[PDB]
């Protein structure tokens, strides 16, 4: 199947929450730029024509791999709706 799916399911209160989180996370992973991730370091996304998944294959496979770590935070009302898109634009550049 797909990496720690159970581990993932366990993080959320609802199944359908783990779908919303990953989907929205993948959204922004493209929009603000792709390096928005929190895990470029030692071991991260990879593909083999050459190992280059490091740039833009599957957004969603990333989101999950990050969410499986404890860096992201998904709340019902975490950060004010419009003001986020503004500060994310400011900090994450190749749009």
Partner 1 sequence: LSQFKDETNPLSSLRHKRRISALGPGGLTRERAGFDVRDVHRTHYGRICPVETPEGANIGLITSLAAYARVDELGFIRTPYRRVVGGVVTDEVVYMTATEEDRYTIAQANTPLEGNRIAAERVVARRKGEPVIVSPEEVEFMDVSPKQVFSVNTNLIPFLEHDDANRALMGSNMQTQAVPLIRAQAPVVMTGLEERVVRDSLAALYAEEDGEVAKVDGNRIVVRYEDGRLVEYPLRRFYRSNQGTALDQRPRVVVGQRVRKGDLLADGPASENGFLALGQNVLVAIMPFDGYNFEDAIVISEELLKRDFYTSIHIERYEIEARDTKLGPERITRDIPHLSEAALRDLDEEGVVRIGAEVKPGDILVGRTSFKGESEPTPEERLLRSIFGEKARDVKDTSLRVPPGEGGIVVRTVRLRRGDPGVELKPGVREVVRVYVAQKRKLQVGDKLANRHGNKGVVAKILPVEDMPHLPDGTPVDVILNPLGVPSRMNLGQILETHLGLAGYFLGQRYISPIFDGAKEPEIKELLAQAFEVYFGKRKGEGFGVDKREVEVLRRAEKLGLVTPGKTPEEQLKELFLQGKVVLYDGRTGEPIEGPIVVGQMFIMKLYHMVEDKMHARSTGPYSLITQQPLGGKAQFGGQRFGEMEVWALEAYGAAHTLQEMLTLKSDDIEGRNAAYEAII
Partner 2 sequence: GRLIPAGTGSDFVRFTQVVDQKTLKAIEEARKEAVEA
Partner 3 sequence: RVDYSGRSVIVVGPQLKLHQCGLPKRMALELFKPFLLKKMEEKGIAPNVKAARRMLERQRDIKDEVWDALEEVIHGKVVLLNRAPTLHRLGIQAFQPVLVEGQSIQLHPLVCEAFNADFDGDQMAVHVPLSSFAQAEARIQMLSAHNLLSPASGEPLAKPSRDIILGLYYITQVRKEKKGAGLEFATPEEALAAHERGEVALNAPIKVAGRETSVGRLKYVFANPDEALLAVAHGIVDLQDVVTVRYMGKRLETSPGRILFARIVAEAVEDEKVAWELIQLDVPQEKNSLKDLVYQAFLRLGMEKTARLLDALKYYGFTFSTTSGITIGIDDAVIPEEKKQYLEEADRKLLQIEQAYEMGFLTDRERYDQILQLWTETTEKVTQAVFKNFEENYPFNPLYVMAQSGARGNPQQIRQLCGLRGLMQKPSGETFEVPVRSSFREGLTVLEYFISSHGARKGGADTALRTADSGYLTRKLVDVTHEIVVREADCGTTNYISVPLFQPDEVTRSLRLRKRADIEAGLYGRVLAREVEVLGVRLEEGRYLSMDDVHLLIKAAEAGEIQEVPVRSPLTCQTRYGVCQKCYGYDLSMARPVSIGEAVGIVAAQSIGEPGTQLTMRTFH
- Interface residues with partner 3 (CB under 8 A)? 1-2, 5-6, 8-9, 14-16, 18-19, 22-24, 26-27, 30, 47, 49, 53, 57-61, 63-64
DSSP string, 27-52: HHHHHT-GGG-S--SSS----SSSS-
38 binds partner 1 (CB under 8 A): no
Binding track over 35-74 against partner 2, x by CB under 8 A: -x-x--------------------------------xxxx
Q: Which two tokens stand for residue 10?
A: 């366990």
- Please say whether the dihedral angle defined by the alpha carbons of residues 79, 80, 81 and 86, taken in this order, is positive or negative: negative
83 binds partner 2 (CB under 8 A): yes
Instruction: Kindly report the number of other CB atoms within 10 A of residue 40's CB atom.
Output: 10
Are 15 and 9 contacting, i.e. CB atoms less than 8 angstroms apart?
yes
Q: Which is nearer to partner 3, 19 or 85 (CB)?
A: 19
- Among positions 1, 2, 10, 15, the unique one binding partner 1 when judged by CB under 8 A: 15
């Amino acid at each position: 199947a797909e990496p720690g799916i159970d581990k993932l399911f366990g993080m959320v209160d609802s199944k359908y929450r783990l779908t919303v989180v990953v989907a929205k996370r993948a959204q922004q992973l493209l929009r603000h730029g792709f390096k928005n991730t929190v895990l470029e370091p030692e071991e991260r996304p990879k593909m083999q024509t050459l190992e280059g998944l490091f740039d833009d294959p599957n957004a969603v496979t990333w989101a999950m791999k990050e969410l499986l770590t404890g860096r992201l935070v998904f709340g019902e009302n975490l950060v004010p709706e419009d003001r986020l898109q503004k500060e994310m634009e400011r900090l994450y550049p190749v749009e």
